[PDB]
Amino acid sequence: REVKLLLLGAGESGKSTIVKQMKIIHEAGYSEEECKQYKAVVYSNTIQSIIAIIRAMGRLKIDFGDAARADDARQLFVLAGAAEEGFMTAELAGVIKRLWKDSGVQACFNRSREYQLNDSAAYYLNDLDRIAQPNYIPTQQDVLRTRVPTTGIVETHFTFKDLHFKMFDVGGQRSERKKWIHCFEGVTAIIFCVALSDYDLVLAEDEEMNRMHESMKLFDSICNNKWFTDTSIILFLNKKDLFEEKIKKSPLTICYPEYAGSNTYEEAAAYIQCQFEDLNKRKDTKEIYTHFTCATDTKNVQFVFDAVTDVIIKNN
Ligand SMILES: Nc1nc2c(ncn2[C@@H]2O[C@H](COP(=O)(O)OP(=O)(O)NP(=O)(O)O)[C@@H](O)[C@H]2O)c(=O)[nH]1
Ligand SMILES: [Mg+2]
């Protein structure tokens, strides 16, 4: 009645977000006290996001739409220290709001594939009035949107369908992959996460490596590892929401030069799925269970995980 699930995938693929969803779906969510613990994370993520955009403006040579923002940028650094401690004054919120609304800042934001920017930047910056409110308490979605790369191994437990799940989460950044092997024993199923929207991005560890290519190499290694022959391989093609928006404006040929389909979700998503599934060297004896997901969407993850659990029960 015990099931061990191991989450694998490159950095930023959404592994830890899936972990959070298990608590929300099967453990009644994050309590008020638990949500408050994420307040400083939300504020830090928010401040780091606007700062990253401002830093990129210097690198890409983008001016502020309105010269008055120069002073707001100065004040941002003077007041930024508070956010990290869990405090968001009306003054700091005002500074961030004006910067976020600037046309130059927006021009830079829309060129984020050229630098490293948290996926939840817009989510938080567009909700400044709410998160800056007095006595602000992060919502479940706010918690799901937080970003903190995983170092070490995280173990979570929950019950579902009369089964006791033991979920293991590890970091996917290059420096953390050496630790994956510590979790290789007795795995019932591997949930390998892939950020669909990574197709036109490069690794933060190396700007010369395409993120999706890196993910493919990792999947090739895991899926074909003889050690996992009897371990169910679940493939989560994640960030489908970001992918749907991006495929409309950024050519998939950046990642796959041979792609001949249109700049639409269905054709492009199916193509990527085929690229990953084709890495399977034993197609007749090893099955991959693929699901398209939006890890921050609780309803999507609930239905997908329900489907995944059924396969695990029937196969293992
Ligand atoms: N829009 C969107 N954001 C997502 C999705 N999945 C994850 N994110 C966001 O992407 C960021 C990174 O997610 P996270 O789960 O930390 O990634 P990870 O694979 O655990 N990273 P690491 O390997 O470094 O530990 C978070 O801010 C999270 O909220 C998705 O499907 N859509
Ligand atoms: Mg993580």
Is the CB of residue 237 less than 8 Å from the CB of residue 292?
yes
- Other CB atoms within 10 Å distance of the CB of residue 260: 9
User: Which tokens belong to 127?
Assistant: 């909700």
Asked whether the beta carbons of 30 and 23 are under 8 A apart, the reply is yes
Gap between the Cα atoms of 299 and 305, Å rounded: 10
Most ligand 1 atoms within 8 A of CB, residue of 119, 193, 203 to mutate: 119
* Listed resolution, Å: 1.5
Instruction: Give me the domains of the chain, ranges plus CATH numbers.
Output: 1-30+150-316 (3.40.50.300), 31-149 (1.10.400.10)
Closest residue by CA, ligand 1 atom 32: 239
3-state secondary structure at position 29: coil
Our answer on whether the CB atom of 48 is closer than 6 Å to any ligand 1 atom is: no
**Residue 109 exposure: Cα atoms within 13 Å on the Cβ side:** 20
DSSP H/E element including 56: helix 39-60
Residue 16: CB atoms within 10 Å: 23
How far is CA 231 from its chain centroid? 24
C-alpha Rg value of the chain to the nearest Å: 21
Residue 174: count of CB within 10 angstroms of its CB = 15
Name which of 219, 164, 176, 174 is nearest 195 in CA terms. Answer: 219
202: three-class secondary structure by DSSP: strand
What one-character DSSP code corresponds to residue 284? T
Sequence ranges of the binding site for Mg(2+): 16, 150
Q: How many residues does the chain have?
A: 316
- The C-alpha atoms of residue 87 and residue 78 are separated, in whole angstroms, by 14
Contact 146, 296 (CB under 8 A): no
What's the DSSP call for residue 14? S
CA-nearest of 201, 214, 213, 11 to 115 is: 201
- Residue type at position 124: Y
Residue 69 tokens, joined: 């923002």
C-alpha 133 chain-centroid distance: 26
CA distance 194 to 240: 10
Residue 155 to residue 53: CA distance in whole angstroms: 34
150 Cα nearest atom in ligand 1: 25
The one catalytic residue among 55, 111, 113, 147: 147
Torsion of CA 105, 10, 8, 145, to 10 degrees: 0
